[PDB]
């Protein structure tokens, strides 16, 4: 079901879908960042989930999408509920454009999440 | 009213005005897309409105930001309404970012946007 489809579909659908599950999503910002393992952001412009239990999660999830002043609502929240937060701009930069929320990570973004994984593995 | 304001503030208050500016709009997407003078893309991904009128604008106005498949429908009504849509992918990019909506464009957009606006006078 999380299954992200790189080579099925276009840009296009890719574009729509992108937008859909963002729209569908139920969560509040609390919610989401509570469900997260840790956040990769590019300070005061975007702030990324991502989730990865072994067993459970076959790869990475990208949980949430914040920008702008929304990022600092994350910081906070993430610092009252233990999840850590890294910065990695080009890695947020380019989950934002190219990631499926509630999706696996795209093929792109394996080697930069799994140093992140590493990290938060310690 | 209108000033970008580079010196002044910080990088958390630049982000929190962007996100103030963008919620206050009044206007919806056609009403945005007729108002702009030409469109920048970065197809599938983003579409940022501007607009520049001699006398009236003393700098380039950045009108709005769609993102994903909303670009597909801004392309639409841009052919629609005869509002020209450029392939621009880092000046896009560079003024979603950056860019304040309904404000002049950041100092750093300057070189790029005229380029885009010596084409538009031709
Ligand atoms: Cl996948
Ligand atoms: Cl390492
Ligand atoms: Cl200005
Ligand atoms: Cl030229």
Known sequence: ?????EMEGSPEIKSKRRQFHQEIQSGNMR???????????????????????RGETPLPLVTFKYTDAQVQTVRKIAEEEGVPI???????????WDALVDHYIPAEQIEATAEVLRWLER
């Open 31 to 53: 919610e989401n960042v509570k469900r997260s393992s840790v956040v990769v952001a590019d300070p005061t412009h975007i702030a990324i989930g991502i989730l990865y239990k």
């Open 86 to 96: 890294l910065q990695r701009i080009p890695l947020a930069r380019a989950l934002y």
């Open 1 to 5: 079901k999380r299954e992200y489809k």
